[PDB]
Protein backbone atom coordinates (compact mmCIF):
# COMPACT_ATOMS: atom_id res chain seq x y z
CA UNK A 1 0.00 0.00 0.00
CA UNK A 2 0.93 3.70 -0.26
CA UNK A 3 -0.59 5.31 2.87
CA UNK A 4 2.00 7.95 4.09
CA UNK A 5 2.65 11.31 2.39
CA UNK A 6 5.97 13.18 2.18
CA UNK A 7 6.58 15.22 5.36
CA UNK A 8 8.75 18.36 5.03
CA UNK A 9 11.58 18.77 7.53
CA UNK A 10 10.31 22.34 8.14
CA UNK A 11 6.87 23.99 7.83
CA UNK A 12 8.48 27.31 6.76
CA UNK A 13 11.96 27.66 5.19
CA UNK A 14 13.91 30.92 4.84
CA UNK A 15 16.35 31.94 2.08
CA UNK A 16 18.07 34.95 0.47
CA UNK A 17 18.56 36.09 -3.12
CA UNK A 18 20.22 39.10 -4.79
CA UNK A 19 17.70 41.51 -6.40
CA UNK A 20 19.46 41.20 -9.82
CA UNK A 21 20.28 37.47 -9.51
CA UNK A 22 21.01 35.52 -12.69
CA UNK A 23 18.96 32.50 -13.78
CA UNK A 24 19.62 29.39 -11.73
CA UNK A 25 21.09 31.19 -8.70
CA UNK A 26 20.80 28.81 -5.67
CA UNK A 27 18.64 30.14 -2.83
CA UNK A 28 18.06 27.22 -0.46
CA UNK A 29 17.43 23.46 -0.25
CA UNK A 30 14.14 22.10 1.08
CA UNK A 31 13.64 18.53 2.28
CA UNK A 32 10.91 15.96 2.98
CA UNK A 33 10.82 12.23 3.85
CA UNK A 34 8.24 9.48 3.33
CA UNK A 35 7.23 6.92 5.99
CA UNK A 36 6.41 4.06 3.53
CA UNK A 37 8.89 1.12 3.16
CA UNK A 38 12.20 2.47 1.66
CA UNK A 39 13.58 1.81 -1.86
CA UNK A 40 10.08 1.81 -3.45
CA UNK A 41 7.96 4.37 -5.43
CA UNK A 42 5.54 4.90 -2.48
CA UNK A 43 8.45 6.55 -0.61
CA UNK A 44 10.19 8.17 -3.64
CA UNK A 45 9.75 11.94 -3.11
CA UNK A 46 9.91 14.45 -6.02
CA UNK A 47 9.67 18.24 -5.49
CA UNK A 48 7.59 20.85 -7.39
CA UNK A 49 6.42 24.51 -7.08
CA UNK A 50 2.82 25.73 -6.84
CA UNK A 51 0.86 28.73 -8.11
CA UNK A 52 -2.56 28.61 -6.45
CA UNK A 53 -2.18 31.38 -3.87
CA UNK A 54 1.23 32.76 -4.94
CA UNK A 55 1.63 32.55 -8.72
CA UNK A 56 4.19 35.35 -9.07
CA UNK A 57 6.84 33.79 -6.81
CA UNK A 58 6.25 30.65 -8.91
CA UNK A 59 6.85 32.71 -12.07
CA UNK A 60 10.41 33.67 -10.90
CA UNK A 61 11.47 30.73 -8.69
CA UNK A 62 11.60 26.98 -9.26
CA UNK A 63 12.57 23.97 -7.15
CA UNK A 64 14.66 21.12 -8.62
CA UNK A 65 12.71 17.85 -8.80
CA UNK A 66 15.24 15.45 -7.24
CA UNK A 67 17.68 17.57 -5.20
CA UNK A 68 15.14 20.01 -3.69
CA UNK A 69 17.29 23.13 -4.29
CA UNK A 70 15.25 26.30 -4.78
CA UNK A 71 16.60 28.54 -7.54
CA UNK A 72 15.82 31.46 -9.83
CA UNK A 73 13.70 30.45 -12.81
CA UNK A 74 14.69 33.75 -14.50
CA UNK A 75 17.29 36.51 -14.38
CA UNK A 76 15.50 38.62 -11.81
CA UNK A 77 14.97 42.32 -11.33
CA UNK A 78 13.06 42.65 -8.04
CA UNK A 79 13.38 45.33 -5.34
CA UNK A 80 15.41 44.89 -2.07
CA UNK A 81 13.75 44.11 1.33
CA UNK A 82 10.86 42.28 -0.47
CA UNK A 83 9.68 38.93 0.88
CA UNK A 84 8.07 36.32 -1.37
CA UNK A 85 6.06 33.27 -0.30
CA UNK A 86 7.05 30.43 -2.64
CA UNK A 87 4.93 27.30 -2.22
CA UNK A 88 6.68 23.93 -2.64
CA UNK A 89 4.93 20.57 -2.94
CA UNK A 90 6.76 17.29 -2.36
CA UNK A 91 4.99 14.24 -3.85
CA UNK A 92 5.75 10.48 -3.99
CA UNK A 93 5.57 7.95 -6.91
CA UNK A 94 2.98 5.88 -5.04
CA UNK A 95 -0.49 4.64 -5.84
CA UNK A 96 -2.42 6.66 -5.07
CA UNK A 97 0.17 9.48 -5.30
CA UNK A 98 0.30 11.42 -1.98
CA UNK A 99 1.91 14.81 -1.19
CA UNK A 100 2.24 17.76 1.25
CA UNK A 101 3.22 21.42 0.81
CA UNK A 102 5.47 23.98 2.54
CA UNK A 103 6.53 27.63 2.24
CA UNK A 104 9.90 29.16 1.43
CA UNK A 105 10.05 32.78 2.55
CA UNK A 106 12.65 34.40 0.33
CA UNK A 107 14.31 37.73 1.09
CA UNK A 108 15.40 39.91 -1.83
CA UNK A 109 18.73 41.43 -0.73
CA UNK A 110 22.33 41.99 -1.84
CA UNK A 111 25.04 40.15 0.10
CA UNK A 112 27.53 43.01 -0.41
CA UNK A 113 25.12 45.51 1.23
CA UNK A 114 25.22 43.55 4.53
CA UNK A 115 27.63 45.37 6.88
CA UNK A 116 31.18 44.30 7.76
CA UNK A 117 32.86 45.21 11.06
CA UNK A 118 36.36 46.68 11.28
CA UNK A 119 37.35 43.84 13.71
CA UNK A 120 35.86 40.52 14.88
CA UNK A 121 37.05 41.17 18.48
CA UNK A 122 37.12 44.61 20.12
CA UNK A 123 39.20 44.76 23.30
CA UNK A 124 38.74 48.21 24.84
CA UNK A 125 40.68 49.41 27.93
CA UNK A 126 39.38 48.15 31.34
CA UNK A 127 36.42 50.08 32.78
CA UNK A 128 36.47 51.03 36.53
CA UNK A 129 33.75 49.32 38.53
CA UNK A 130 32.85 52.77 40.01
CA UNK A 131 32.40 54.39 36.56
CA UNK A 132 29.23 56.53 36.35
CA UNK A 133 26.34 55.95 33.97
CA UNK A 134 27.15 57.13 30.42
CA UNK A 135 30.90 56.56 30.80
CA UNK A 136 32.22 55.54 27.37
CA UNK A 137 33.55 51.97 27.32
CA UNK A 138 34.57 51.47 23.71
CA UNK A 139 33.34 51.96 20.15
CA UNK A 140 32.53 49.66 17.19
CA UNK A 141 32.75 50.43 13.48
CA UNK A 142 31.18 48.93 10.35
CA UNK A 143 30.81 49.93 6.67
CA UNK A 144 28.38 48.88 3.91
CA UNK A 145 27.97 50.12 0.34
CA UNK A 146 25.29 52.89 -0.11
CA UNK A 147 24.31 52.16 3.52
CA UNK A 148 24.19 53.88 6.89
CA UNK A 149 24.61 51.48 9.76
CA UNK A 150 22.46 50.78 12.79
CA UNK A 151 24.33 49.04 15.62
CA UNK A 152 22.84 46.76 18.31
CA UNK A 153 23.97 44.58 21.23
CA UNK A 154 22.32 41.19 20.64
CA UNK A 155 23.76 38.98 23.41
CA UNK A 156 25.89 38.87 26.55
CA UNK A 157 24.44 41.94 28.25
CA UNK A 158 21.83 40.12 30.36
CA UNK A 159 22.53 42.34 33.37
CA UNK A 160 21.72 45.59 31.43
CA UNK A 161 25.15 46.81 32.54
CA UNK A 162 25.75 48.26 29.08
CA UNK A 163 24.06 50.16 26.32
CA UNK A 164 25.08 51.22 22.87
CA UNK A 165 24.43 54.31 20.85
CA UNK A 166 22.65 52.61 17.94
CA UNK A 167 24.03 55.11 15.38
CA UNK A 168 27.57 56.04 16.55
CA UNK A 169 28.24 52.46 17.67
CA UNK A 170 29.56 53.80 20.99
CA UNK A 171 29.18 51.31 23.81
CA UNK A 172 28.54 52.88 27.22
CA UNK A 173 27.88 52.02 30.88
CA UNK A 174 24.16 51.70 31.63
CA UNK A 175 23.96 50.31 35.18
CA UNK A 176 26.58 50.52 37.94
CA UNK A 177 29.30 47.89 37.74
CA UNK A 178 30.57 45.69 40.54
CA UNK A 179 33.93 44.00 40.08
CA UNK A 180 33.19 41.52 42.88
CA UNK A 181 29.96 40.41 41.16
CA UNK A 182 31.52 40.12 37.70
CA UNK A 183 34.99 40.95 36.33
CA UNK A 184 34.33 40.66 32.59
CA UNK A 185 31.75 40.47 29.86
CA UNK A 186 31.60 39.51 26.20
CA UNK A 187 29.04 41.26 24.10
CA UNK A 188 27.68 40.06 20.83
CA UNK A 189 27.11 43.01 18.58
CA UNK A 190 25.43 43.44 15.26
CA UNK A 191 25.53 46.01 12.51
CA UNK A 192 22.47 46.02 10.26
CA UNK A 193 21.90 48.36 7.34
CA UNK A 194 19.37 51.09 7.89
CA UNK A 195 17.39 50.04 4.82
CA UNK A 196 17.06 46.61 6.50
CA UNK A 197 16.18 48.00 9.94
CA UNK A 198 13.38 50.12 8.39
CA UNK A 199 11.77 46.98 6.89
CA UNK A 200 11.66 45.46 10.46
CA UNK A 201 14.38 42.89 9.61
CA UNK A 202 17.71 41.63 10.92
CA UNK A 203 20.11 39.62 8.77
CA UNK A 204 23.01 38.10 10.68
CA UNK A 205 26.12 36.68 8.94
CA UNK A 206 29.79 36.15 9.81
CA UNK A 207 30.92 39.64 8.85
CA UNK A 208 28.16 41.74 10.50
CA UNK A 209 28.64 40.27 13.96
CA UNK A 210 31.58 40.81 16.28
CA UNK A 211 32.60 40.31 19.93
CA UNK A 212 33.45 42.94 22.56
CA UNK A 213 35.60 41.89 25.56
CA UNK A 214 34.99 44.30 28.42
CA UNK A 215 37.18 44.09 31.53
CA UNK A 216 36.08 45.45 34.90
CA UNK A 217 38.67 47.34 36.96
CA UNK A 218 38.49 46.76 40.73
CA UNK A 219 38.42 49.72 43.07
CA UNK A 220 37.96 49.86 46.86
CA UNK A 221 34.24 49.67 47.50
CA UNK A 222 32.19 47.50 49.93
CA UNK A 223 32.96 43.89 48.98
CA UNK A 224 30.03 41.48 49.06
CA UNK A 225 31.04 39.11 51.76
CA UNK A 226 28.39 36.41 52.09
CA UNK A 227 25.13 35.88 50.28
CA UNK A 228 22.30 33.55 51.19
CA1 LIG B 1 4.06 7.75 0.21
CA1 LIG C 1 31.27 47.56 43.35
CA1 LIG D 1 35.70 46.51 44.83
Q: What is the CA(169)–ligand 2 centre distance, in A?
A: 26
Do 101 and 50 sit in the same domain of this protein?
yes
How was this structure determined? It was done by X-ray
Same domain, 24 and 79: yes
Distance CA 57, CA 55 (A): 6
Give the ligand at the shortest distance from the Cα of 177: 2
Give the resolution in Å.
Answer: 3.3
Domain shared by 66 and 101, yes or no: yes
12 and 70 assigned to the same domain:
yes
Into how many domains does the chain fold?
2
Residues 125, 219 within the same domain: yes
Q: Ligand 1 centroid vs 10 CA: distance in angstroms?
A: 18
Nearest residue to 21 (alpha-carbon basis) of 69, 71, 56, 70:
71
Residue 129 Cα to ligand 2 midpoint, Å, equals: 6
Among 96, 100, 109, 117, smallest CA distance to 209 is for: 117
For residue 43, give the ligand nearest its CA: 1
Rounded (5°) CA angle 156-137-179: 65
E-strand stretches of 99-223: 99-108, 116-117, 121-122, 127-128, 136-139, 142-143, 149-155, 162-164, 170-173, 184-193, 209-217
Which CATH number do you get for residue 189? 2.60.40.60
Rounded distance from Cα 100 to ligand 1 centre (Å): 10
Determine the structural domain holding residue 194 and report its residue range: 113-228
Q: Do the beta carbons of residue 173 and residue 157 sit within 8 Å?
A: no
Do 107 and 171 lie in one domain? The reply is no
Amino acid sequence: MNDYPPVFSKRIYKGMVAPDAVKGTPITTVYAEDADPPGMPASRVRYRVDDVQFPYPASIFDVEEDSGRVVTRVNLNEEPTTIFKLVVVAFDDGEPVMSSSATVRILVLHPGEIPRFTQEEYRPPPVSELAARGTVVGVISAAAINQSIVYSIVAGNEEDKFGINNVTGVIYVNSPLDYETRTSYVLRVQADSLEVVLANLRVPSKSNTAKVYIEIQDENDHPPVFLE
